[model samples]
Target: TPDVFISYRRNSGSQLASLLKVHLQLHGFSVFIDVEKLEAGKFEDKLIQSVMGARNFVLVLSPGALDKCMQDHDCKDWVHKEIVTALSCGKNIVPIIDGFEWPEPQVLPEDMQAVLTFNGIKWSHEYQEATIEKIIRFLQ
Candidate 1:
């Protein structure tokens, strides 16, 4: 089973997520990224199960993800639902702010806001061994 489920928009943070995944694996944490593992059919159920199973949820926050979450679509954005569900499930929800100015509470749901207040790690600069160490510490 995976220790963390990483949620992000493909076009936005695919490279970052890929790099993190490899680093996490090397450090012995099973990292799950939807782009590599998710199949076409039964998306909702598969997503829910992954969220429920993970020990922690890592949200790769970006402007696109924020906009997508606020949309009125029935399915809702996967990251939004996963974050809320992780909060409800009492799992660790780590918001990895990837260079954007953090959103105000009024702009985010209460669950997301709670995690945001913890002052998440920022990946604005290039990845380094030190950065991966910080992330591993956060996961612990």
Candidate 2:
């Protein structure tokens, strides 16, 4: 099983997710990231399983990461679903706030509001190496 399962939005967080995966792997931590296109019924199980199997659920919140959730009420959205699954399964949730801020709960889906309660670390571009070190320490 992987030590970290990364969840991110394709447009906002993909590149950061890939960078994080490489950094984590280089430090001997097994990481899981879904790079494949998600097919509704078929991919749900795989994602849920990965979330269930992972020790840490690392959420990459780039600028617009939660914008879709704010715009839609449907819980079927992959990022929403992944977060819900991680919350329900009691995984260690680490929200990486990379130039992202939480809007009021009224603007967010009810199911996703709880995400705002978790302590998150700000990802710094200028101090990339230091940020990764901090992340690694948190993971440890």
Candidate 3:
């Protein structure tokens, strides 16, 4: 089983997510990305199981990350589905907020509103060593 399930928007958080995946992989941690693991149009039970079974659920919070979440209350959007699945499974939600802050719980869909309650780790391009250390420590 992977140690983490990383969910991020393709345009907004892809670069950051890729960097994170490299570091995590270098440390011998198994990390799963929905886009990379499951082929497009094939997000199935096994993918959900991988997410639900992970030790951590990392939501990469970049610009427009909430666009789909804000729209989908019934979990039709796969990003929204991943989030609530992790929540329903009671996994740790470590949001790596990059270039944005968590939206108010009320503004998000009912199933994803819980994300606002968790502490978020910020990541900026200039200097992310501290935050990266924090995230590394968090997974430990």
Candidate 4:
């Protein structure tokens, strides 16, 4: 089992997620990033299990990360499901706010609204190493 589970938007957040995984592993932290395309049954079980097995859920909120959640609330989206599961499981949620303005809780799905309550770390491109150090400190 991994120590960290990373959730991100493939279009906008994948790059940062990949970067974080590389650094986190170098620091001897086991990390899991959801980079595979999925279907409903087996992949669904895998995603949920991965979320449950991890201690940290690092959310990468790049621009438009919440777009699909805003539009659909039936829990069909994988990111939506990952977040909801993390919240329910009481995993440590660390939102990496990257170029994304958090919307009002009312605009998000009821289950996802709790995400705003967690402390968020701002990602700075200029001081990327410093940011990773902070994240490493938190996990430690």
Best by TM-score: 4
Superposed by TM-score, candidate 1 places the C-alpha of residue 13 at a distance from the truth, in angstroms, of: 1.4
lDDT of 2 by residue, 7-116 (tens): 99999788999999999999999899987323356677978888899999999999989887765677868898899888888788999998887888889777678888
Best candidate, lDDT: 4
Who is ahead in lDDT, 2 or 3? 2
lDDT per prediction?
0.74, 0.86, 0.82, 0.89
TM-score of every candidate relative to the true structure: 0.85, 0.91, 0.90, 0.93
Residue-wise lDDT of candidate 1 within 70-130, one digit each (tens)? Answer: 5333537677777777877888767777765665667665545565656477774665787
lDDT of 3 by residue, 57-137 (tens): 888989878887786766787778888888888888899988886677787888878878888888857777677778888
lDDT, residue 89, model 2: 84
All candidates in order of TM-score, best leading: 4, 2, 3, 1
Deviation of model 1 at 1, angstroms: 1.7
Model 2: CA > 4 A from native:
36-41
The C-alpha stretches of model 4 lying farther than 4 A from their native spots are 36-41
Which residue pairs show collisions in model 3? none
User: Count of backbone clashes for each model?
Assistant: 0, 0, 0, 0
lDDT of 1: 0.74
